[PDB]
């Protein structure tokens, strides 16, 4: 029987590492969605701004026309910030899913090994 109480003693130790490895992946996940929903709004800001001085776009002497180029530059800087921040939230949502399923089947194993 004591060949098996080490297989619960180490199984409990496996859900311990997977719980910390889930809590670390939830802080990383919430951080990312945060920086992203922020940067996605500095983007949509830029794009409405574009549509504001979009009326000047085909008329380079206009001077509101410059407001439209400035708008796009800040949108393109914003767009590369949305792409950086989305890649990282995709990197964090892959490691929340992987850690949720790793924990969840470490618990299934733990429940089989609790069977005395």
């Amino acid at each position: 029987y004591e060949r098996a109480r080490a297989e619960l003693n180490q199984a409990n130790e496996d859900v311990a590492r997977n719980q910390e490895r889930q809590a670390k992946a939830v802080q990383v996940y919430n951080s990312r969605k945060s920086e992203l929903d922020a940067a996605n709004k500095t983007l949509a800001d830029a794009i409405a701004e574009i549509k504001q001085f979009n009326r000047f776009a085909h008329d380079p002497m206009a001077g509101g026309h410059r407001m439209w180029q400035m708008a796009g530059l800040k949108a393109q800087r914003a767009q590369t910030d949305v792409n950086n921040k989305q890649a990282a939230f995709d990197a964090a949502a892959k490691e929340k899913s992987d850690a949720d399923a790793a924990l969840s089947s470490a618990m299934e194993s733990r429940k089989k090994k609790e069977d005395k």
């Binding site: 776009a57 380079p60 002497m61 509101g64 407001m67 180029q69 400035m70 796009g72 530059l73 767009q79």
Partner: protein
């Protein structure tokens, strides 16, 4: 000014007769008599040139040659693409200093066959060398606080070695103290042998100019611009009886700040366009029969700085071109052609070509017919901006021209009609926020030039009708002038040199910037006299006076933007 020499057609020296496309030439002497105080003020005088500007000197401006877009004229400085056109893709000469301009060769019609991109309407080569021994001190005071101070000398340093220097200072109001040009220039030119020779040069200007900006509460107001441009070049030339070759490298570096005086210059509010153009050219030419054959290469590199031209990152555009030129006079027929292949970093290759024959059917009278294709590459923002599309094609142009020139009764003249069907025009799309190639224009235009003597009295008349149109909506391109009439009048009487220069600008349609949704309003077609005189007070010292806009008869070229009224310029120059 015919049967005097040009270099702009085929790169090498050739009599203007032999050039079939119509060419105007302006000299330093001409510029001095016009007392012109900017490059725009010179081009504006010449057939088929229609210029728009957001005010006066220093302000943003666009040349439309024979109906074509602003971006369709190729402006060269000493046969190299004007560095201040890199970022924007279109040519603005308002910042370029008149002090430097020493000759203008301007050949209408296409010439991408020789020069590469942007040569669709025509080509304006501003030349910053001339051969006039001596040294000259000049100045002038004028309306709107215009002051000018200029020194300029050419000397034999070695009698096989020439040096040339100019310094110019130029200030005028409009802004606050808004347009300051400071130019320095230096060139060294040596003859290794009667036919081998080489040169070096440097010039630069620093310009400050103030303007009307769009105001946004909470955010800096960018209404000051500091441009620093400089340009170096070096070359060998071979001038043989039969073969000719020239090998010319150039480097141009320009920084363009647009900032708010209160906030800095080096402050995130400021925009900064820093551009470096590198160019290497190898032209060659042999005389063959009664004519020549030419073959050259021009390489061009343009690098920009993160943020330049409203693009996040810095790019490195490159273009290698190789071309061929041909000339043969046989009997009374005459035949030019050219052909070029460009290789562009972004869009790979595009060949271009032109041909033209003339025929002296009677002596003194000539019929010329011409055909050619020409293109404009896409530009930085177009390809790499937020609105960008990095797989755009060149805008393409097919061109057609008929002409009769004659010399009768002491009167030199031309009547010409031209067709110009541009295609692939690169156009913004509000819906998708992007650029694309669909877009087209039909341009049918006429050009009449003449000029002649009566009494001690000399005229340079001309007339243009151009009708530019979208070839889909069949409606006018905004902002062109249906017609202009350009007239000049020259007498030196009792040693007083005079000039009455007159232009009726035609009718133009712009957008009314004042009530969204903006409509169109017709702009009055107006008439524009200028009067100019000059007197030798001494064989070294000329005093020049002028009044532009004689009749205070004010109006605009861009709707909503004031145009200087009657303005007086008292100037003087001292040669030795």
């Amino acid at each position: 000014s015919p049967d005097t020499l040009v270099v702009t057609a085929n790169r090498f020296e050739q009599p203007r007769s032999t050039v079939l496309a119509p060419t105007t030439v302006v000299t330093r002497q001409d510029i001095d008599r016009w007392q012109s105080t900017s490059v725009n003020d010179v081009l504006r005088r010449l057939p088929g040139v229609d210029i728009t500007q957001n005010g006066g000197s220093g302000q943003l401006s666009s040349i439309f040659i024979r109906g074509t877009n602003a971006s369709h004229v190729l402006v060269l400085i000493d046969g190299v693409r004007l560095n201040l056109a890199g970022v924007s893709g279109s040519a603005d000469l308002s910042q370029f200093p008149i002090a430097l301009v020493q000759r203008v060769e301007y050949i209408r019609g296409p010439r991408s066959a020789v020069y590469g991109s942007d040569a669709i309407g025509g080509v304006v080569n501003i030349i910053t060398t001339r051969d006039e021994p001596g040294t000259e001190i000049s100045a002038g005071w004028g309306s709107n606080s215009y002051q000018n101070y200029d020194v300029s000398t050419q000397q034999q340093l070695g009698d096989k070695t020439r040096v040339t220097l100019l310094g110019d200072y130029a200030h005028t109001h409009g802004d606050n103290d808004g347009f300051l040009s400071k130019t320095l220039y230096g060139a060294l030119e040596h003859n290794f042998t009667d036919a081998w020779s080489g040169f070096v040069r440097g010039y630069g200007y620093d310009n400050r100019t103030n303007y009307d900006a769009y105001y946004s509460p909470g955010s800096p107001l960018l209404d000051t611009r500091k441009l620093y441009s400089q340009s170096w070049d070096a070359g060998l030339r071979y001038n043989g009886e039969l073969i000719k070759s020239q090998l010319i490298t150039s480097y141009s570096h320009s920084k363009d700040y647009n900032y708010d005086p209160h906030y800095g210059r080096y402050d995130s509010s400021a925009t900064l366009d820093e551009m470096k153009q590198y160019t290497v050219q190898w032209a060659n030419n042999v005389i063959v029969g009664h004519g020549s054959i030419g073959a050259g290469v021009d390489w061009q590199k343009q690098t920009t700085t993160p943020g330049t031209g409203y693009v996040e990152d810095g790019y490195d555009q490159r273009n290698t071109g190789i071309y061929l030129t041909g000339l043969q006079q046989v009997g009374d027929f005459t035949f030019e052609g050219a052909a070029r292949s460009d290789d562009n970093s972004q869009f790979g290759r595009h060949g271009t070509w032109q041909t033209s024959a003339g025929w002296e059917f009677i002596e003194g009278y000539r019929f010329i017919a011409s055909y050619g294709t020409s293109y404009k590459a896409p530009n930085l923002g177009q390809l790499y901006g937020f609105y960008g599309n990095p797989n755009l094609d060149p805008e393409k142009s097919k061109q057609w021209e008929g002409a009769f020139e004659g010399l009768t009764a002491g009167v030199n003249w031309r009547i010409s009609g031209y067709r110009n069907d541009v295609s692939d025009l690169i156009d913004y799309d509000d819906h998708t926020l992007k650029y694309y190639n669909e877009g087209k224009a039909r341009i049918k235009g006429v050009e009449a030039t003449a000029n002649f003597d009566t009494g001690p009295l000399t005229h340079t008349v001309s007339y243009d009708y151009v009708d530019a149109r979208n070839a889909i909506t069949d409606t006018p391109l905004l902002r062109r002038a249906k017609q202009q009439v350009k007239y000049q009048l020259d007498w030196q009487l009792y040693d007083f040199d005079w000039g009455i220069t007159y232009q009726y600008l035609g009718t133009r349609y712009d957008k009314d910037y004042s009530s969204y949704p903006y409509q169109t309003v017709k702009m009055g077609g107006v008439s524009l006299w200028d009067l100019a005189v000059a007197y030798p007070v001494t064989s070294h010292l000329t005093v020049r006076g002028k009044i532009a806009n004689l009749f205070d008869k004010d109006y605009e070229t861009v709707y909503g933007y004031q145009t200087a009224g009657r303005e007086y310029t008292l100037s003087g120059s001292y040669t030795f």
